[PDB]
């Protein structure tokens, strides 16, 4: 029994075969259309049918986003079918860019952007693996600053007047986690007592840094390329009944993560050496804060004067002061 469990953990799980691109290519193919010679309105292909199923499930009214292994697996497959990824030639880089554009077109020509927006809206601000997969798929289809995907997303949001999408975004920001000295110290006490960590890293400290980075990277990719439309819509949604200031939500989360980073600084200031676990926690928190700073920079570059004024009147300066203290001492 011990061998069975260890074998499952060490060999079966570590087995990796790559099939996502081929499967998506197979699903995007029409089947013998001139042979059935209907020559009417073109039928939606299997990939389009699958995306339509996911979109309909997201659009169905529910009190909670139901966990769906099918949606998770196929969102992961579609996300991995896009990236497909020393120095390279200009021709090689351009071919890579065109290949990525074609792979993203395979999905966003069949409703993928609308599906991810609908899933985020139906999340209703509750974090989970569904939302993580949706954000990863959105990042996969938005990598490189896809102007067509951005335009489709904005057009869908403006047409549907989806206040729920922005409310869910704000809820996800509020639910995003930060560094936890209480959990870190309890973990250190447990290690000192000597109990074996049943989880690989005791990852409870900074619960979902990958999810936080994915969320803020999706927000940055919405505005990538100095997209004035999103970098104004995220601040204020003109045609909607209610408005959520995504810029202010982002700066609030930046303030929180800065406070947590300062907490770890103050904890480790007296000690001569930083433990490996603490150093890993600093690395993850610094990565999250870096992503947040990049998201704010994407918010305000291509000068968006509304976003600039909002950040100037927000609590950005307190976070910057704390970061300056932390930098000047940890340097």
């Amino acid at each position: 029994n011990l061998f069975l469990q260890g074998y499952e953990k060490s060999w079966i799980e570590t087995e990796e075969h790559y099939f996502e691109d081929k499967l998506i290519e197979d699903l995007a193919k029409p089947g013998a259309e001139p042979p059935e010679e209907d020559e009417g309105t073109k039928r939606v292909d299997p990939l389009h049918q699958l995306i339509l199923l996911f979109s309909r499930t997201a659009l169905t009214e529910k009190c909670k986003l139901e966990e769906d292994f099918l949606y998770m697996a196929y969102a992961d497959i579609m996300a991995k079918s896009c990236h497909d990824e020393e120095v390279k030639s200009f021709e090689e880089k351009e071919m890579e860019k065109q290949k990525l554009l074609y792979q993203q077109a395979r999905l966003h020509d069949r409703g993928a952007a609308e599906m991810v927006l609908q899933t985020i809206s139906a999340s209703k601000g509750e974090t989970g693996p569904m939302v993580a997969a949706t954000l990863k798929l959105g990042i996969a289809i938005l990598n490189g600053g896809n102007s067509t995907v951005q335009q489709k997303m904005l057009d869908y949001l403006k047409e549907k007047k989806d206040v729920g999408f922005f409310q869910s975004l704000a809820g996800l920001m509020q639910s995003c986690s930060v560094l936890d000295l209480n959990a870190f110290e309890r973990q250190n006490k447990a290690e000192g007592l000597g109990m074996v960590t049943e989880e690989g890293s005791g990852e409870k400290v900074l619960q979902d840094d990958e999810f936080t980075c994915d969320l803020f990277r999706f927000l940055q990719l919405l505005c990538e390329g100095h997209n004035s439309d999103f970098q104004n819509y995220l601040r204020t949604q003109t045609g909607n009944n209610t408005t959520v200031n995504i810029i202010i939500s982002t700066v609030d989360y930046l303030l929180r993560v800065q406070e947590s980073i300062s907490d770890f600084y103050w904890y480790y200031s007296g000690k001569d050496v930083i433990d490996e676990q603490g150093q890993r926690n600093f690395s993850k928190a610094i990565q999250v804060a870096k992503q947040v700073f990049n998201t704010l920079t994407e918010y305000i570059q291509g000068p968006c004067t509304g976003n600039q004024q909002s950040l100037a009147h927000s609590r950005l300066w307190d976070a910057v002061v704390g970061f300056l203290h932390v930098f000047a001492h940890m340097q």
């Binding site: 799980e13 089947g31 049918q49 309909r56 309890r186 006490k189």
Partner: protein
């Protein structure tokens, strides 16, 4: 070409159907794409199957078959509305499993089969049915809680698995607290077993759960027991019976493997001092008499039949003097276990010094000395020769003074010969003398 394989055949068939027609049935679309993903995720099938794979030797086959049959009956009874017949059937099934040897010898098999999840589902169904009103089928809740307590006690991994259900059990902690002999058959008992003597889970305990427990304790200390006053007990202003249960859960939360968990102890002390009504009428801190006075009033209540009984083992008759005694004893025991360590005191930690000072302010030394000095009732020999033995469940017991001594040693400590000799003269020596006098053949 010929598929030569079920996997290739299924992949081709699903793709061909999907491109042949626009499927109008969402269930059909879902089944098709689930099957296709299964064909392309043959590794995932093993990833899901090996954790639910368990091997046994030949000698355990019959017992495993019987256990699986009982588990199948219990699982099938999830699909029917709970009634008297279903209650009897699941009680029999849980008893059969609990009497099966494979249950004890293979805890990993039970956890893989997810028995705790099934029994928790049943308990959730029973409690949610009439959660607001009186609990229908309390005997199912008792049996399920007893099964989950045994499951926790089998192994630490079972205890860790049951620990994930702590929030629900704490929300349902007040199901059968007032009923005696329901001891060890309550969701609070299950929650206590999910943490008992497990340092990792005691440390994983977080502040909101302790706040829930402290809120329940404050409610018990502020209001009387509605069911007890409906069954005739005099309407005192508080609920020692439930207060003692919550104090016991907090004791298990703060004390683990003979050593105090300092984080939980500090948090519980802070919450208790923020809600001072958790300490009971004597230690309310506004117009209340001392702990010794509370013990003496409880003595008078216990030896007064009218104030003790409902007046229309415990059964309906919960002895209220003993209940008050046990509540105060449990509170003092919990505080003594929450007291900080002497090595921390010597090192001079401000938090430890502050907590010890808070406990000293709560409990005067004279109260502890007097309660220890309180004398016991003694088993006597009647003129016939038969032993006239008092019912200890309705009177003062040595465990109360044991808690007294625990608090006195942990918080105050004995460090001066004058105090040591005074305490020995007043409280300890009479007890040793009485125990020595109880050394006759019949009275021992």
């Amino acid at each position: 070409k010929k598929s030569s394989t079920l996997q290739q055949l299924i992949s081709e068939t699903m793709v061909r159907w999907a491109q042949e027609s626009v499927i109008e049935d969402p269930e059909l679309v879902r089944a098709m794409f689930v099957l296709l993903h299964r064909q392309y995720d043959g590794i995932g099938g093993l990833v899901r199957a090996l954790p639910k794979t368990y091997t046994i030797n030949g000698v355990s086959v019959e017992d495993t078959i019987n256990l699986l049959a009982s588990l199948g009956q219990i699982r099938s009874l999830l699909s029917v509305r709970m009634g008297k017949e279903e209650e009897k059937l699941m009680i029999r099934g849980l008893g059969d499993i609990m009497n099966n040897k494979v249950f004890y010898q293979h805890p990993n098999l039970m956890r893989a089969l997810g028995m705790h999840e099934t029994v928790m589902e049943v308990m959730v169904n029973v409690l949610g049915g009439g959660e607001s009103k009186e609990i229908t089928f309390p005997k199912m809740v008792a049996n399920c809680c007893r099964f989950l307590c045994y499951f926790c006690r089998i192994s630490r991994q079972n205890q860790k698995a049951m620990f994930d259900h702590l929030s629900y059990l704490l929300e349902n902690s007040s199901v059968g607290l007032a009923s005696p002999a329901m001891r060890g058959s309550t969701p609070l008992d299950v929650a206590a077993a999910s943490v008992m003597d497990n340092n990792e889970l005691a440390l994983a305990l977080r502040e909101p759960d302790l706040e829930k427990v402290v809120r329940y304790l404050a409610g018990c200390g502020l209001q009387s027991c509605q069911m007890l006053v409906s069954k005739g007990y005099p309407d005192i202003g508080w609920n020692p019976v439930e207060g003692e249960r919550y104090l016991d859960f907090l004791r298990f939360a703060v004390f683990c493997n003979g050593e105090s968990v300092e984080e939980n102890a500090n948090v519980v002390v802070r919450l208790l001092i923020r809600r001072p009504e958790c300490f009971g009428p004597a230690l309310r801190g506004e117009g209340g008499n001392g702990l010794l006075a509370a013990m003496e009033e409880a003595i008078k209540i216990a030896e007064d039949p009218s104030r003790d009984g409902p007046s229309p083992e415990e059964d309906d008759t919960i002895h209220m003097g003993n209940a008050i005694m046990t509540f105060y004893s449990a509170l003092i025991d919990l505080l003594g276990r929450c007291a900080p360590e002497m090595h921390l005191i010597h090192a001079g930690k401000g938090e430890a010094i502050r907590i010890r000072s808070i406990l000293r302010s709560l409990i005067p030394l004279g109260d502890l000395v007097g309660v220890i000095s309180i004398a016991f009732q003694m088993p006597t020999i009647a003129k016939d020769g038969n032993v006239v033995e008092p019912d200890m469940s309705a009177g003062f017991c040595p465990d109360h003074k044991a808690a007294m001594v625990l608090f006195l040693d942990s918080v105050y400590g004995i460090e001066v010969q004058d105090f040591l000799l005074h305490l020995l003269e007043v409280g300890f020596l009479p007890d040793l003398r009485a125990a020595a006098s109880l050394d006759t053949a019949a009275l021992s």
